């Protein structure tokens, strides 16, 4: 293979073959990596890495192939997990300090005790004799100690040799000599294979004077080409990340005993107040008001003592403890001669490079200036890191590790094309995340990890990929919707963070509405969960979104249902099945926590009366029959086949009669909840009287009375007395009467004794008598 330095055709073909080998196993294709381990072996890889007469292109290709086969997957996993700090609280965590000793000198980055949770590192042994087929999880094994020792030795040799500026670099070019080797070193350092001693040695190699622990020049001061400068910038970026992680862990360690002191003290103050509550009720009230505030406000106002701020009741001892720790943290961050520090070293090196050469690579310019800004703004690192910092107790460590592994699996699958196996894998991951307890017990950790964002990225990938033509993988959309609904339900803050995406969800609200057995797993359901039982978000709802929902409802009321007419259902001129869900979402929008929202109710009523087609064939006018006539016709349709079913199991049966009845009931319930309140009617708000008059004009009293008077079908016990229960998915469910009564009470109201008695005679009393007759145990 060393003869390829003079055979250009074979050299190019083999280089592109190595590129194809990398491509086929790119992005965590462990099966393909295991297969490639046969064609390219560990001894061949090591020989290619170590040989000095290797052609540059083949050397780079083999370095890339080694990294992709054996290290890329775990390196990518760890680098993805990097920007999140989950620090379990143990005695090891508590033992962490900002500085190694009293002398405030920065230690070398990386070395020390770090307790932040990191992804588990696992490899599978490549063996084609075995038939287990379970080795296709995890990347193939490789000798990590041997690779690390070889990398250190080769980097030392390269530093010693290139310092002489010889005309014989490995690969024929300084780039070919350094870029692959430094890329391998950076990958290993990202993986965290290097221990304390090897970290010390390689930091000495990178820069001897700055990293010296108490002529010869490091890699930073060597007059590097641009790709090597970019790799060095990546290395310094990782070192800064290590410093930030150490700072975060030290902050958590201090926060432990600081919070321990604060909590015991607050208990003492509350006990003192309870012992001395007797001077005045008012004085006790506004001195215990601090305890009545939410815990976030308690923490904030207990910490509100940075400058003066006598409102803070924190004693001077605890204040001095926090102040001393804050001063230590600022000194470590560098807020307040040999550089002797990574911050200076990076700053001077970047400025020197920029003023030494006109950099032709925009990526290099951006990396260098990002690094310089990060060095100067040490506070910004903590500002971005602390929101992503979460602490847990020891008992939750294993569950948190499992949840992080599942989240990493989902995030990794985000980088591959959507397929059947990918759908299966990520559905399994989402289900595991459901069954994990930390998901329920730590909503703030979930939001900090931003899991809803990843799930919606998956959702967008599935939907926007030609959702207009056909939605491929609807099971995945259903699973994502279920996940997002549970995420809404877990916490109120999760609901608010979820509410930010109402526009997209309402835009794609028509994904799986008309298909049963997937209710509660549609984007409309996700939006309804986001708005559910939250007065703030219900008020934050907007007329454009409500108008979008009303337009969708009008389209449903004007046009038929395409899947149903294709499947064989009779073609009626409207879509009750899809309209009902929009009505339900509007009901959630206008009604919240047992009370109506006046603004939303008025807006919805105005939009509905602007577009009268939303009420269906009946209630539209110009030849539309009454509500009672429509309900009776729907009852007849449900009873009679060839009009209720398709006539060419719940997927095949839609029960159009029940669909129509449920749509009308939902519309009536929505109008009843949109109706104003009786005290406001007494006050005399012209808008309220207008709304009531509009609703009364829409719904005649006689129609409601007749629908309430419509009889039911009770079960019978005949032919040996076995219970014959009529099917309810086709029948007249009492929820329709419940909606009727809700509207009747809210809009019309019953005040006249004569009207109440007539309504009792023609309406409820038959139902009461039938319910009494159904007192038989088997019938009950």
């Amino acid at each position: 293979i060393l003869e390829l330095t003079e055979q250009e055709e074979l050299l190019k073909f083999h280089y592109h073959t190595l590129r194809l080998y990398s491509a086929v196993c790119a992005l965590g294709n462990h099966r393909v990596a295991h297969a490639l381990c046969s064609h390219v072996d560990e001894p061949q890889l090591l020989y290619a890495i170590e040989n000095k007469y290797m052609p540059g292109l083949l050397r780079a290709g083999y370095y890339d192939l080694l990294i992709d086969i054996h290290l890329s997957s775990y390196a990518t996993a760890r680098l993805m997990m990097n920007n999140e700090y989950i620090v379990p609280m143990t005695e090891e965590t508590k033992s962490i300090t900002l500085f190694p000793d009293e002398n405030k000198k920065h230690g070398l980055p990386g070395i020390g005790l770090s307790t932040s949770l990191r992804p588990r590192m696992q490899f599978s042994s490549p063996s084609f004799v075995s038939i287990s087929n379970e080795c296709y999880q995890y990347s193939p094994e490789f000798p990590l100690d041997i690779l690390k020792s070889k990398t250190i030795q080769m980097l030392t040799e390269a530093v010693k040799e290139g310092s002489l500026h010889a005309r014989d670099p490995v690969g024929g070019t300084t780039e070919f000599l350094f870029v692959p080797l430094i890329k391998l070193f950076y990958t290993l350092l990202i993986m965290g294979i290097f221990h304390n001693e090897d970290l010390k040695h390689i930091l000495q190699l990178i820069e001897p004077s700055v990293f010296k622990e108490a002529p010869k020049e490091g890699l930073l001061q060597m007059k590097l080409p641009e790709p090597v400068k970019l790799q060095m910038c990546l290395l310094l970026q990782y070192l800064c990340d290590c410093q930030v992680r150490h700072r975060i862990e030290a902050i958590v360690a201090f926060s432990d005993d600081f919070v321990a002191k604060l909590q015991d003290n607050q208990r003492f103050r509350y006990n003192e107040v309870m012992q001395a509550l007797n001077m005045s009720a008012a004085l006790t009230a506004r001195k215990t008001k601090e305890f009545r505030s939410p815990p976030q406000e308690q923490i904030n106002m207990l910490l509100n003592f940075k400058d003066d701020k006598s409102e803070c009741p924190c004693p001077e001892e605890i204040r001095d403890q926090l102040l001393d720790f804050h001063e230590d943290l600022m000194t470590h961050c560098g807020i307040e001669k040999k550089s002797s520090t990574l911050q200076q070293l990076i700053s001077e090196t970047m400025v020197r490079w920029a003023q030494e050469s006109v950099i032709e690579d925009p990526e290099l310019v951006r990396a260098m200036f990002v690094l310089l800004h990060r060095q100067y703004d040490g506070i910004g690192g903590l500002v971005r890191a602390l929101p992503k910092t979460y602490t847990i107790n020891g008992v939750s460590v294993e569950d948190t590790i499992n949840l992080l592994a599942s989240l990493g699996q989902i995030r990794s699958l985000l980088s591959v094309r959507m397929g059947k196996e990918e759908e299966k894998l990520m559905i399994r991951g989402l289900g595991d995340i459901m069954n994990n307890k930390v998901f329920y017990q730590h909503p703030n950790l979930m939001r900090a990890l931003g899991m809803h964002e990843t799930v919606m990225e998956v959702m967008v990938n599935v939907l926007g990929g030609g959702e207009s033509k056909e939605i491929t993988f609807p099971k995945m959309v259903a699973n994502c919707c279920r996940f997002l609904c549970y995420f809404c339900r877990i916490s109120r803050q999760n609901q608010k963070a979820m509410f930010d995406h109402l526009s997209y969800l309402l835009e794609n609200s028509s994904v799986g509405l008309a298909s049963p057995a997937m209710r509660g797993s549609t984007p409309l359901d996700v939006a309804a969960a986001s708005v559910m039982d939250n007065n703030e978000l219900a008020l934050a709802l907007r007329e454009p979104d409500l108008e979008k929902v009303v337009r969708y409802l009008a389209g449903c009321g004007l046009q038929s249902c395409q899947m149903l007419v294709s499947k064989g259902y009779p073609d009626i001129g409207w879509n009750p099945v899809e309209g009902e869900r929009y009505l339900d979402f509007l009901r959630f929008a206008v009604f919240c926590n047992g009370e109506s929202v006046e603004e939303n109710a008025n807006v919805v009523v105005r939009l509905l009366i602007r577009r009268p087609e939303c009420f269906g064939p009946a209630l539209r006018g110009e030849g539309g029959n009454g509500l009672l006539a429509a309900m009776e016709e729907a009852i007849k349709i449900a009873e009679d086949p060839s009009r209720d079913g398709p006539s060419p199991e719940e997927d095949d049966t839609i029960h159009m009669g029940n669909a129509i009845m449920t749509f009308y009931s939902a519309l009536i319930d929505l109008l009843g909840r949109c109706a104003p309140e009786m005290h406001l009617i007494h006050a005399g708000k012209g808008e309220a009287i207008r709304i009531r008059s509009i609703l009364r004009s829409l719904i005649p009293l006689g129609d409601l009375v007749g629908v309430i008077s419509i009889a039911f079908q009770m079960p019978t016990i005949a032919k040996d007395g076995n219970v014959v229960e009529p099917d309810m998915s086709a029948g007249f469910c009492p929820d329709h009467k419940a909606a009727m009564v809700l509207f009747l009470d809210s809009v019309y109201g019953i005040e006249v004794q004569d009207f109440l008695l007539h309504l009792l005679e023609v309406g409820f009393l038959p139902d009461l008598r039938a319910a009494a007759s159904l007192d038989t145990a088997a019938l009950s």
């Binding site: 958590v252 807020i335 920029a354 925009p362 200036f369 803050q493 608010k496 008020l539």
Partner: protein, 331 residues
């Protein structure tokens, strides 16, 4: 966890240290040129390289101006270095003015004005942190009515025939927000029910008052010093295929602000006592309207007959009448 969040919000975030002037001086220093010994084409300094990178990114054709982490950081650094901030004497006042001129030269000698114009043009009228930082940097460079920066900006606009700059400027002008009596009453009802979300105080009323003030102060600084060239170019662009009347757009926004202020006046007319948040909103709206009035006064201050005729034929009179009504009854 609660303590960590509170510490981040109260102590770490509130920490402020001043480094922008030193950092930009270090970037501007060329350094070790004779040691470099090449000197083939008078190499550029790191600050010039950074400004060139940002300008090339802005000039690159894209459908949407993507947010730039780096552009936030360095535009803020540049503006802070530019401003670098009782009775004082004429000598020290002139010293401060000369220092400001030198600090603005440090940037506009390297293409900062062209970067600002390019970024505003690429914003395409969509409000965001990009255009906010760009406007802040432009204000910092143009503070005091920098004639050199004004000339550079006008020359660049005329040479490039940038209709997109004015189109995006106008789009931002309509995108600027005003007072919102609806969603102010919603906030009042939320306060009445008593429980507030974990998010900060509702700023839906006057969504970006700082952004609006920055935009109109940028326009005022463009026209500052009775610069007839800008005063006429904003009204009409001779060399461009399409023209946009910035003066009339400013009049339209002023009318919108006047209508919103009248809306809050009528809301608070019955109530004897002004609520604290209503006073907040009134103060912010008054500040925005004051900035708009100053911008118009700068349009017309140095006698510009075209701008004066445009204002006379515009809807300024209705806004002035409404403002007079509001002034009288608030008094």
């Amino acid at each position: 966890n609660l303590f960590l969040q509170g510490y981040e919000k109260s102590w770490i975030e509130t920490e402020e240290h001043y480094f922008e002037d030193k950092l930009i001086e270090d970037l501007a220093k060329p350094g070790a040129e004779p040691p470099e010994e090449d000197e083939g084409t008078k190499r550029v300094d790191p600050l010039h390289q950074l400004i060139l990178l940002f300008s090339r990114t802005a000039l690159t054709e894209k459908c949407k101006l993507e947010e730039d982490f780096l552009y936030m950081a360095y535009a803020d650094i540049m503006a802070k270095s530019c401003h670098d901030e009782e009775v004082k004497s004429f000598e020290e006042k002139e010293m401060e003015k000369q220092k400001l001129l030198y600090q603005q030269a440090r940037l506009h000698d390297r293409g900062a004005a062209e970067m600002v114009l390019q970024t505003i043009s690429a914003s395409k009228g969509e409000t965001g942190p990009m255009v906010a930082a760009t406007l802040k940097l432009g204000i910092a460079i143009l503070n005091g009515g920098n004639s050199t920066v004004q000339q550079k900006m006008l020359d660049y606009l005329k040479e490039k025939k940038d209709v997109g700059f004015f189109q995006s400027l106008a789009g931002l002008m309509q995108s600027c927000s005003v007072l919102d009596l609806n969603a102010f009453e919603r906030q009042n009802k939320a306060e009445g029910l008593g429980m507030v979300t974990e998010e900060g105080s509702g700023e839906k009323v006057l969504q970006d008052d700082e952004f609006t003030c920055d935009l109109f102060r940028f326009l005022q600084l463009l026209c500052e010093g009775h610069n007839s060239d800008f005063q006429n170019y904003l009204r009409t662009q001779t060399g461009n295929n399409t023209t946009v009347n910035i003066i009339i757009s400013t009049v339209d926004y002023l009318l919108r602000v006047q209508e919103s202020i009248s809306d809050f006046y009528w809301y608070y007319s019955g109530k004897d006592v002004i609520d604290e948040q209503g006073q907040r909103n009134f103060s912010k709206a008054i500040q925005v309207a004051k900035q708009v009035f100053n911008t118009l006064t700068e349009y017309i201050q140095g006698p510009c007959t075209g701008n004066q005729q445009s204002l006379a034929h515009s809807r300024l009179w209705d806004a002035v009448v409404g403002f007079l009504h509001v002034f009288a009854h608030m008094q």
